[PDB]
Amino acid sequence: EKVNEILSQLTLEEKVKLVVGVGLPGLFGNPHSRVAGAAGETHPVPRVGLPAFVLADGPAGLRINPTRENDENTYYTTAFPVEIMLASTWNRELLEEVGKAMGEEVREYGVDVLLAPAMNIHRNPLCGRNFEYYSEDPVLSGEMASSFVKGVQSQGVGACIKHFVANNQETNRMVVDTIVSERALREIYLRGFEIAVKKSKPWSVMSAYNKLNGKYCSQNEWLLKKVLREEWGFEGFVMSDWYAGDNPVEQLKAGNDLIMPGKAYQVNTERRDEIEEIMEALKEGKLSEEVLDECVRNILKVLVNAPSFKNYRYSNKPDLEKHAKVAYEAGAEGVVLLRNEEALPLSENSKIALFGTGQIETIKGGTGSGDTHPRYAISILEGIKERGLNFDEELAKTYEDYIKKMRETEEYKPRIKPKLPENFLSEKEIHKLAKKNDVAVIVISRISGEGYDRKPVKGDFYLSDDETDLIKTVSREFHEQGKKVIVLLNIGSPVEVVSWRDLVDGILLVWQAGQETGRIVADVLTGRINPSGKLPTTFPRDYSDVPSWTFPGEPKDNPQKVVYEEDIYVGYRYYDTFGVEPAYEFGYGLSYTTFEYSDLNVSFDGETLRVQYRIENTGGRAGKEVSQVYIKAPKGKIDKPFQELKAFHKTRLLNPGESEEVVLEIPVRDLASFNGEEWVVEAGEYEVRVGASSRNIKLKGTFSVGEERRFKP
Amino acid sequence: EKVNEILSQLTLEEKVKLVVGVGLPGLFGNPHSRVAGAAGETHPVPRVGLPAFVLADGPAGLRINPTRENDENTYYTTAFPVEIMLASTWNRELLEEVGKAMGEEVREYGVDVLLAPAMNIHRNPLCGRNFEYYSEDPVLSGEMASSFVKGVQSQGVGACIKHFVANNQETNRMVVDTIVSERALREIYLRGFEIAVKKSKPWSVMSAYNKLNGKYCSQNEWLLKKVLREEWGFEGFVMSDWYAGDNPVEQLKAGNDLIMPGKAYQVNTERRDEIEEIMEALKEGKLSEEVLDECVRNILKVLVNAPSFKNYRYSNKPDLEKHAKVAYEAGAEGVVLLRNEEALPLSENSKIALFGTGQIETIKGGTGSGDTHPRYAISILEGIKERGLNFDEELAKTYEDYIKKMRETEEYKPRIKPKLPENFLSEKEIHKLAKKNDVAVIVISRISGEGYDRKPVKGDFYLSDDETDLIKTVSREFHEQGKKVIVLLNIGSPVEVVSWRDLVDGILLVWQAGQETGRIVADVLTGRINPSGKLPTTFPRDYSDVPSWTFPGEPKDNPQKVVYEEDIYVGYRYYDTFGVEPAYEFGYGLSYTTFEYSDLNVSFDGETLRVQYRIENTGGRAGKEVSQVYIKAPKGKIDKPFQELKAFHKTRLLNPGESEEVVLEIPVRDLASFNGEEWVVEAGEYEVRVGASSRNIKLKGTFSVGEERRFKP
Ligand SMILES: [Br-]
Ligand SMILES: [Br-]
Ligand SMILES: [Br-]
Ligand SMILES: [Br-]
Ligand SMILES: [Br-]
Ligand SMILES: [Br-]
Ligand SMILES: [Br-]
Ligand SMILES: [Br-]
């Protein structure tokens, strides 16, 4: 209507301008976007009243420049916990809240489309961007993304789900050919995106850098048209990842509508200006105006609903304080208690000896486009000060001076920050600290970021020798006295845990909780927060145990391809099916209280499976319980994983003795497996497994499918 | 014709008698079969000139009573190497020879049908009968069985392939419900039987004890009629395993023609006489005479070709000496050299210190119906004496007296023989032996048998403490002097190998080689035989590494079901696909010489794949080379193993510098995967991997399938 109005007005060249970004703003010869720091803008066409639309990162919060040249004003953003921590909440409602808060900020700073959430599968722990992805499971990931997208888009701005698809490693991501069976695609990698597209209707999708089965995703017609549109019914537009692909017209033919960020010749001497090349292809009949029209329409159908289109006056002053409370809540529910041998929460009196250089160099989140620049970021130490806990002040001063000393030293100064030695304390000095203090609290920290994969080496997936030395020594001397030790994992992805976990009494997976980290952590120690998070990803006993062994491809040092040999058997699907025991299993997490499951009733009417059960707080402290419903399908015709997560739920805050009724519905189509051509729901007996984790099944029931069901996409 | 002649003559009750055995001969009230020791006989019907047909075990050689009461004559049989060792030859031609030798014996002792070969898949190393099965791979197993069956049946007698199907554990085999996807069935478990049925046309098939997906195999119409007959075109008859199933008429309705051994009421107070029950069902219209007719016809169509039918006068005097040479050959090519750090073969002079109680208590094969009673069985020690090798005579006397001493002791006398302590030698006594001798040779022995599964415990899958003590001590002191140590594995199935293999210099997998064992072993040490065997099964680093973790079912102590969670990913299919490293991989084996592969040419004409390559003996001793061709199919639509064995070959005896041309053809239908409904050969690029083992690939080529191909059975 209005869209088809503008379309009939546009000249050929205006249509071309519209499908290409204006170049990376503020860099190279490029002018800052009106929202300095923004990832990109579209070409304005003042004529027909088209404004430049603004795109900005990212998954951990709006990423824009805090300050602006010749400006007295401020533009700070809320830095939320990382996605893997958000996912650990297993809380849709909360994700929706996080989306609304980010959404308000996005709107009020004049941004039209937020580049989030990222929702690639956790194929392998070493992936540099796992921290900004949700899960190794498509249901958990898809559900979380949907909730986040509904939140963002309740605010009049756009969400962009990414990266479509199978961007599961950073190594050579812009060239690597990802070889994946159609079955693994549909069951694992596309599956999350399918859920998000159908349940939340994101304004836009960002095509991945990598090739899929021979074709760049930004140039893959099967992916962007056949799957995305013709099967799933996507009605937004697709944009390319930044500088992705190698042919602009092939991108438009495949259904990649918006090429970003534009002016690719600025980072690759080989690329042509994308507008020149497209104009040429229309001129030569390599590209038809009809195809160009469909691209422009896809973009316009969406962006006429953007605030920019309606000249919306933004305040440049969102409610930061209100949002910080949301970020704190998000983190509070996302901390995972991994181990507690009568160690947590800490007694009121408890005098804490705080170890680990990361108590001060607290990691708020990984680097890259998923980074953020908040007005502040509370470290673990500062959090403990603020809460006025009983910490060893002499030790804290010792660390403060140690860090500053070596950060100024040639071998350990920023360029990225080199990893500092952790065993600088005398064996005797720790003996004294053990006599003086009540408990020990050890922070071990890890950081990753876009563009770099982790390696299965010490200081990375494994503890460095100095870290294991520190833990062994602190453990021994604090255990010498009748005292407890606690480790805080300030990490973005699984690390080795088996070799040292038996040495310590408590283990909090604090991940990377954004600006409010220290505050969240302090409140978890004291029991003010009752941990309710659970793993969205499997912690392997050793790196050699992970099924995605081909990571990061062949040849290892410069991978040109990587094939998913493990296929659908990725994450817990692998460990359950082939009987490999994880260090900590998918969906595992402890509580400061106990829960009891009961009253299971499963019913299937041929179109809907209904699982009902009661969860009662059986302990002495209020808490939330995440419950998980796995379906074990019969063996029947084709091979299937041991079980598959089909639904989940997080109870309200239950006081002791309180209980809740849990009612979950699963459509029969979600019980299907893909056989290469069709989705099939095989007839036979199915098991319902309601768990507190994938291996802690509290309730079991069966139901039967009488007639097989088939679905050809 | 003749069959349909007799059929029209038979009375109703004669037809019934014919489909039931006459009871277990020589046991309970039962008379010995005319061939005493035979497993069973059919009912004679002198009227229409029908004789009692004789059935006898077994896979390791004809099993009958050597002596007969009131008889001056002898009836000894050749005891061949066990099937897992036969399979290790990877030699079809040789298997055919073994079949002919067994076949002649079977004929001349008045037996009509030999109950062999057994060809169940090696799902799990712990299975008690793995020793009498070929492989974890269906191509290797099916090819070996086919070659054996052609051999047996060139002699005018019948072969019986068993056990159909998925009899992969002994625990509760007569009741356990085996839960297997149709895909795993068709790709792994049925697949071997399919090959044997189509390539060799066995006279008969023996249905397994266990249930398959809810139905006893002897009562499973899908298996015995739909798969066996309607799809595969089987034209023999099916007999039940001994006392299998629980309903005689259900057995006949399913396509199980001959019920064996008859008189099931003799071992199970609950069963009725099968003739009574069948007569009753015909009487009541539970069973139609038409179905009975088809059973009797199936039996008769086959057995009118049996020697008994034509009153064949057998000599009761086969050529034992000629066959013993075949048994020696079989074993010679079936020994697997696993490790050789410049230790083998032994120098002419070498003075051998022989350790291990199994040097005298040499295991010729496992127990059960697969057992045999040969006129003699050469132990490892006796073999070394006979060959006149330079062994420590003082030590041999020490062992001889030790064994006899404790075999007479209460704790270690037969009832089965309790496992004897192996570390009875002083640390000092071994020091002296190390000074006196040139090399050490350590025999470690294992035995299993029908009806008992092995456990992943010391003394079984793992070395007992005394065995590892012995090896550690002998290794240390012989290595103290500049001397070598060798271990001989006289086992029927994989054992743990990683913990101790680095301590020793050589390792010969001698399996269990039947009556000629000692002779074969001696000739391998001296280099008279150049080892050419290769593993038909994977040796796991540890038992926890094996994918068939559900073995032996739920509940563990009294399993009522066992589901194949690992599905098609069994054996090397699992280890390759999910990157778990074996101790020794499928198809691995060393040689006293070296070989070089070359001149690869692969061509595909759309119906046949052709792989050609040259193998040259590049070393200093004559030898044979087993080569293996694995196909790695593209990922395409459905998940597939990393690679799959599709063909193999064993070269002639090549002298140094000699070479051979290898030409192998693979029908396009063998490139297929089963998707639950149809066999599919997906289009795309395929890799040819010609290996000296599954992980030692010497040649690679690609070919392409242009158009997909489909086959609905
Ligand atoms: Br993905
Ligand atoms: Br733990
Ligand atoms: Br990390
Ligand atoms: Br690869
Ligand atoms: Br089988
Ligand atoms: Br080795
Ligand atoms: Br054994
Ligand atoms: Br089971």
Contact at CB, A635 and B579, closer than 8 angstroms: no
Using a 10 angstrom Cβ sphere, with 0-12 exposed, 13-18 middle and 19 or more buried, the burial of residue A47 is exposed
Type of residue found at B256: N
Can you tell me the distance from the alpha carbon of B645 to that of B587, in angstroms, rounded to the nearest whole number? 10
- Please give the residue range of the domain that contains residue A578: 319-594
The residue among A248, A257, A241, A238 whose CA lies nearest residue A296 is A257
If asked whether residues A393 and A429 sit together in one domain, one would say: yes
Domain CATH code at residue A431: 3.40.50.1700
For residue A42, the 8-state DSSP code is B
> What is the rounded CA–CA span in Å between residue A217 and residue A241?
10
Question: In degrees rounded to 5, what are phi and psi of residue B310?
Answer: -100, 35
DSSP element (H, E) containing B291: helix B289-303
CA angle B623, B627, B631 (to 5 degrees): 175
Q: Which of A569, A594, A619 is the last residue of a domain?
A: A594
The half-sphere exposure of B18 on its side-chain side, counting CA atoms within 13 A, is 28
* Euclidean distance between the first and the last CA atom of chain A, given in angstroms as a whole number: 30
Residues A220, A337, single domain; the answer is no
Structure tokens at B444: 């470690």
Task: Look at residues B375, B490, B685, B618 and name the one whose alpha carbon lies nearest to residue B85.
Answer: B490
Strand partners, B562: B178
For residue A312, the tally of other CB atoms under 10 A from its CB is 15
Bond into B506 cis (ω within 30): no
- Asked if B214 and B339 sit in the same domain, the reply is no
- Best CA proximity match to B193, nearest among B252, B234, B254, B251: B234
Residue carrying structure tokens 């069976």: A181
Omega before residue A35 within 30° of 0, cis: no
Over the range A61-83, which residues count as b (16 or more CB within 10 Å of their CB) and which as e? bbbbbeebeeeeeebbbbbbbbb
Q: What are phi and psi of B706, to 5 degrees?
A: -80, -50
B568: distance to nearest CA of chain A, Å? 7
Rg (C-alpha) for chain B, rounded Å, is 26
In angstroms, the CA A422 to CA A359 distance is: 12
Which ligand is closest to the CA of A177, given by its number? Answer: 4
Q: What HEC string does A563-624 produce?
A: ECCCCCCCCHHHHHHCCCCCCECCCCCECCCCEEEEEEEEEECCCEEEEEEEEEECCCCCEC
- Which residues of chain A are within 8 Å of residue B567 when distances are taken between CB atoms? 577, 635, 639
- Please state whether the peptide bond connecting residue B175 to the residue before it is cis, i.e. omega within 30 degrees of 0: no
- What are the CA-CA distances from residue B668 to residues B111, B664, B681 (Å)? 40, 13, 8
One-letter amino acid at A543 equals Y
Segments of A94-185 assigned E as strands = 113-115, 158-164, 177-179
- Looking at the fold, whether B603 and B583 belong to one and the same domain comes out as no
Cα-based distances in Å from B43 to A327, B33, B213, B287, B312 = 85, 11, 33, 20, 18
Nearest to B465 by CA among B399, B402, B421: B421
Cβ-contact A673, A184 below 8 angstroms: no
Distance CA B490, CA B365 (A): 9
Which residues lie closer than 8 Å to A643 by C-beta, 6 or more apart? A576, A630, A631, A632, A687, A689, A694
CA geometry: angle A305, A319, A381, nearest 5 deg:
130
Residues A604 and A664 sit within 8 Å (Cβ to Cβ): no
Question: Nearest CB to A676: which of B213, B566, B638?
Answer: B638
Beta bridge partners of B645: B630
End-to-end CA distance of chain B: 30
- Give the C-alpha distances (Å, rounded to integers) separating A236 from A13, A205, A257, A302, A652: 23, 8, 10, 6, 35
Residue ending a domain, choose from A311, A333, A362: A311
Tell me whether B183 touches chain A (CB under 8 Å): yes
Residue type, A488: L
Q: Do residues B461 and B585 share a domain?
A: yes
Residue A60 near residue A108 (C-beta atoms within 8 A): no
- Going by C-alpha positions, the residue among A417, A445, A494, A463 that lies closest to residue A126 is A494
Six token digits for residue A292? 């160009």
Helix axes B465-480, B427-436, angle to 10 degrees: 40
Number of H helices, E strands in chain B: 19, 26
Which residue do the tokens 């876009």 mark?
A: A450
The tally of CA atoms less than 13 A away on the side-chain side of residue A206 is: 27
Query: The tokens of B80 are what?
Result: 């061949």
Calpha distance A346→B704 (Å, rounded): 65
Which backbone phi and psi does B101 adopt, to 5 degrees?
Answer: -60, -50
CA distance B155 to B104: 6
8 Å CB contact between A292 and A286: no
Nearest chain A residue to B578 by CA distance is A547
CB A234 within 8 A of CB A253: no
Which among A23, A115, A25 has a CA at the least distance from the CA of A62? A115
Residue matched to tokens 């009968």: B129
A118 in Cβ contact with A162 (< 8 Å) = yes
Tokens of B496: 């743990």
Experimental method: X-ray
CATH of the domain at B607: 2.60.40.10
Residues B273 and B231 in one domain: yes
Alpha carbons within 13 A on the beta-carbon side of A66 = 11
Q: Do B640 and A564 touch (CB under 8 A)?
A: no
The CA distance from B255 to B228, in Å, is 9
- Which DSSP string do the residues of A463-484 spell out, in sequence order? --HHHHHHHHHHHHHHHHTT-E
Angstrom distance (rounded) from CA B631 to CA B534: 19
Q: Which letter, b or e, does each residue of A35-45 get, where b requires 16 or more Cβ atoms within 10 Å of its Cβ?
A: bbbbbbbbbeb
* Count of domains observed in chain B: 3
Comparing CB atoms, the residue among B180, B636, B637 nearest residue A635 is B180
Q: B684-691 and B40-41: which strand pairing?
A: unpaired
Residue among A703, A709, A549, A690 at smallest CA distance from A628 = A690
Closest by Cα among B145, B159, B147 to B103: B159
- Interface with chain A: mutation pick from B638, B643, B700, highest number of A CBs within 10 Å: B638
Q: Give the 3-state secondary structure of residue B627.
A: strand
* Residue for token pair 């050419």: B532
Are A681 and A690 in contact by the 8 Å Cβ rule? The answer is: no
Cβ(B494)–Cβ(B538) below 8 Å: yes
- Enumerate residues 641 to 680 of chain A having a beta carbon within 8 A of any beta carbon in chain B: 642, 675-677, 680
Residues A649, B150: Cα–Cα separation, whole Å: 62
> What distance in Å separates the CA atoms of residue B107 and residue B94, rounded to the nearest whole number?
20
A590, A628: one domain: no
- CATH number of the domain enclosing A199: 3.20.20.300
Polymer length in residues for chain B? 713
CA B193 – CA B189 distance, rounded (Å): 8
Residue A40: beta bridge partners?
A55
Q: 3-class secondary structure for A628-653?
A: EEEEECCCCCCCCCCCEEEEEEECCC
Backbone angles phi, psi at B230, to 5 degrees: -65, -35
Q: How many CB atoms lie within 10 A of CB A115?
A: 30
Surrounding residues of ion ligand 5, Cβ less than 5 A: B 120-121, 166, 189
Sign of CA dihedral A137, A138, A142, A145: positive
Number of C-alpha atoms within 13 angstroms, CB side, residue A302? 26
Phi/psi at B446 (nearest 5 deg)? -140, 145
CB-based contacts of B440: which residues, under 8 Å, 6+ apart? B352, B353, B355, B433, B434, B474, B475, B478, B483, B484, B485, B486
- A654 and A513, same domain (yes or no): no
Give the E-state strand segments of B544-607 in sequence order: 561-563, 595-604
| B161 DSSP β-pair partners | B205
Q: Do A571 and A612 share a domain, yes or no?
A: no
Q: Cα–Cα distance between A446 and A527 in angstroms, integer?
A: 25
Contact by Cβ (8 Å): B396, B357? no
**Within this chain, do residues B329 and B449 fall inside the same structural domain, yes or no?**
yes
How far does A639 lie from chain B, in Å, by closest CA? 6
Q: Which residues of chain A are within 8 Å of residue B549 when distances are taken between CB atoms? A: 578-579
Q: Are residues A39 and A113 located together in one domain of the fold?
A: yes
> Are residues A373 and A458 located together in one domain of the fold?
yes
* Residues counted in chain A: 713
Residues A147, A499: Cα–Cα separation, whole Å: 37
Q: What's the rounded Cα separation, in Å, for the pair A65 and A74?
A: 9
Let me know if B246 is a catalytic residue: no
Q: Does B635 touch chain A (CB under 8 A)?
A: yes
Please give the radius of gyration of chain A, using alpha carbons only, rounded to the nearest integer.
26
Q: Which two tokens stand for residue A646?
A: 């089909």
Q: Are strands B158-164 and B113-115 parallel, antiparallel or unpaired?
A: parallel
Tell me which of B594, B612, B629 is where a domain ends.
B594
Place of tokens 């079949």: B99
CA of B490 to the centre of ligand 7 (A): 9
